[PDB]
A paper describes a structure:
In this cycle, the C-terminal tyrosine is removed by tubulin carboxypeptidase (TCP) and can be religated by tubulin tyrosine ligase (TTL). VASH2 possesses a non-canonical Cys-His-Ser catalytic architecture. SVBP plays a chaperone-like role by extensively interacting with VASH2 and stabilizing the α1- and α2- helices. A positively charged groove around the catalytic pocket on VASH2 is found to target the tubulin tail for detyrosination.
To directly visualize tubulin tail recognition by VASH2/SVBP, we tried to determine the structure of the tail/VASH2/SVBP complex. By co-crystallizing VASH21–355/SVBP1–66 with the tail of different residue lengths, only co-crystallization with the full-length tail (VDSVEGEGEEEGEEY) gave rise to crystals and exhibited good diffraction. The negatively charged tail interacts with some VASH2 residues in the positively charged groove and in the catalytic pocket, including R211, R212, K157, and A158 (A158 is mutated from C158 to block detyrosination in order to enable enzyme/substrate crystallization). We captured a pre-arranged state of the tubulin tail in the catalytic pocket of VASH2, and this conformation of tail/VASH2/SVBP is convinced by our charge reversal mutation analysis.
Numbering used by the authors:
A (entry chain C): 11 to 15
B (entry chain B): 26 to 60
C (entry chain A): 49 to 299
The structure:
């Protein structure tokens, strides 16, 4: 996963 | 007008999609935390 | 990564690129996309009324009403930004785009929330507005985020939109710009983000037909390379200049 914002 | 009803269906579809991706983003986040 | 540059209604090429994106990113992508696009009927989402400032409101009340409007529009998770924000445009054009956001009433991302927060506070001359931008690092990628800093009656706060509750609105209770910025840095710590750059702009003029663009980068600090006391010294010096002098745009 990527943590956006 | 043909234009106005197209913008409304698109708005309905965007909000349905936004719910799905918000839910996806949430369980991906919980998935990440427990690892 | 996509941005709607085709207006409303969204054109076919932009529309398909949105669906192909979510089809690729979502685990049940094909089944879920077909479910929406083929739905015989879909409920029309309620359209929130644009907040109007009222004499019964405090400044914090007004900011909260603006922020609640933004939350009601919802953060845009679709992968397709719906309004093109050219950051370098004159304010007058950016304000037109902001009216357009209140008419189409679609989800928005951080940059659009900033433009909309300027539009919705142009009427309160005692609220000063200035962009605060962050470049952060997380597990091999850089991330850019922006919020709308607020200064009013001696206090700092912010409006904005984010995937994360702690990376957007902040009450008007920070006694210094540093306390505000440091609260964002501590909020980024929760999500394992290291803050690489912080960029503070100038006060945005309240004239809705301004020929001037927004200055986004009056002060740029490489905070990942700095000790906290020097970050505080630099932000305090800068914020004091904002409140007193009238500064030449860095651009």
């Amino acid at each position: 996963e990527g943590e956006e914002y | 007008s043909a234009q106005q009803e197209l913008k409304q269906r698109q708005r309905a579809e965007i909000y349905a999609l936004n719910r799905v991706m918000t839910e996806l983003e949430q369980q991906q986040f919980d998935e990440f935390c427990k690892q | 990564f996509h941005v709607n540059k085709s207006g409303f209604p969204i054109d076919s090429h932009t529309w398909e690129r949105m669906w192909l994106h979510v089809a690729k990113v979502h685990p049940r992508g094909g089944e879920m996309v077909g479910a929406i696009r083929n739905a015989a009927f879909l409920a029309k989402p309620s359209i929130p009324q644009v907040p109007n400032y009222r004499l019964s409101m405090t400044i914090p009340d007004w900011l909260q009403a603006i922020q609640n409007y933004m939350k009601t529009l919802q953060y845009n998770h679709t992968g397709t930004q719906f309004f093109e924000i050219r950051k370098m445009r004159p304010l007058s054009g950016l304000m037109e785009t902001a009216k357009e956001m209140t008419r189409e009433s679609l989800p928005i991302k951080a940059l659009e929330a900033v433009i909309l927060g300027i539009y919705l506070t142009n009427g309160q001359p005692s609220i000063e507005r200035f962009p605060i931008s962050f470049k952060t690092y997380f597990s091999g990628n850089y991330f850019h985020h922006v919020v709308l800093g607020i200064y009013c009656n001696g206090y700092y706060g912010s409006l904005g939109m984010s995937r994360r509750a702690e990376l957007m609105d902040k009450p008007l209770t920070f006694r210094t710009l540093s306390d505000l910025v440091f609260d964002f840095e501590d909020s980024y710590k929760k999500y394992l983000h290291t803050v690489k750059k912080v960029k503070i702009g100038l006060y945005v003029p309240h004239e809705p037909h301004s020929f001037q663009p927004i200055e986004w980068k009056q002060l740029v600090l490489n905070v990942s390379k700095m000790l906290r006391a020097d970050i505080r010294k630099e932000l305090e010096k800068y914020a004091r200049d904002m409140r007193m002098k009238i500064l030449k745009p860095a651009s």
